[PDB]
Amino acid sequence: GSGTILIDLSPDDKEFQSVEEEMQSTVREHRDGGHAGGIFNRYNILKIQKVCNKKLWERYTHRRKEVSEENHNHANERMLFHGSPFVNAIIHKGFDERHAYIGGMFGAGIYFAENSSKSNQYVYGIGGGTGCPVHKDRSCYICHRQLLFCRVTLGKSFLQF
Amino acid sequence: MAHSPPGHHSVTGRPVNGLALAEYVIYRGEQAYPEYLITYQIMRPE
Numbered sequence: 001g002s003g004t005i006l007i008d009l010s011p012d013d014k015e016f017q018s019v020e021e022e023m024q025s026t027v028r029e030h031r032d033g034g035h036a037g038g039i040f041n042r043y044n045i046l047k048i049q050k051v052c053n054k055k056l057w058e059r060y061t062h063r064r065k066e067v068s069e070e071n072h073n074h075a076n077e078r079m080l081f082h083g084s085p086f087v088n089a090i091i092h093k094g095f096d097e098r099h100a101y102i103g104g105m106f107g108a109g110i111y112f113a114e115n116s117s118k119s120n121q122y123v124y125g126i127g128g129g130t131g132c133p134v135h136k137d138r139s140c141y142i143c144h145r146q147l148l149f150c151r152v153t154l155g156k157s158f159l160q161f
Numbered sequence: 162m163a164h165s166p167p168g169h170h171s172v173t174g175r176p177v178n179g180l181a182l183a184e185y186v187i188y189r190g191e192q193a194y195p196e197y198l199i200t201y202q203i204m205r206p207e
């Protein structure tokens with residue numbers, strides 16, 4: 001009883017279609033030639049679920065208002081991808097310091113990507129880890145993967161080139 | 162978990178000669194909500 005329920009979207013639902021389009025359209029080629037995330041130009045979407053948690057939603061909107069009020073009423077809210085082996089803990093208990101990338105280029109925080117294929121490099125761990133649990137294949141075309149499509153408050157963002 | 166740069170709520174990693182889109186970092190778990198869980202396979206190029 002975490003409070004989290006998952007609601008399946010019909011493929012016929014405009015919401016399913018717009019989320020799929022953001023997933024498919026933000027695939028790119030990676031400088032590792034597919035080492036971390038595998039070799040692919042597109043996905044087979046199997047399911048899209050709405051994550052519903054009243055407590056975690058209120059936790060988000062409370063912080064969003066704090067940021068907004070520090071930034072001329074501008075949350076600077078984006079929809080961004082997150083890949084992680086801990087997506088199950090994230091949807092039940094929320095993001096916290098245990099989801100931080102300690103070794104990240106931009107410091108020990110929680111990372112998000114505009115490129116779905118960037119988040120795909122992290123579903124099996126940092127640099128793809130050892131790949132899918134069943135076949136130990138970072139480029140496995142068989143095993144089901146999960147990504148989060150997340151509402152993220154950026155507020156005033158520090159621009160690192 | 163580190164602190165956001167003084168006077169900031171997040172970091173934007175701006176992308177070398179690239180087609181790459183931006184990456185972002187938050188230092189508070191409360192600044193993200195996991196709206197959608199997407200289940201998928203990567204597809205072998207033809």
Ligand SMILES: CC(C)Oc1ccc2c(=O)[nH]c3sccc3c2c1
Nearest residue numbers: 081082083101111112113119122184
């Ligand atoms: C390389 C860095 C600048 O950008 C990213 C972009 C996206 C992600 C992501 O979706 N999940 C995870 S889990 C640990 C790190 C990351 C990550 C890092």
Ligand SMILES: [Zn+2]
Nearest residue numbers: 132135140143
């Ligand atoms: Zn596999």
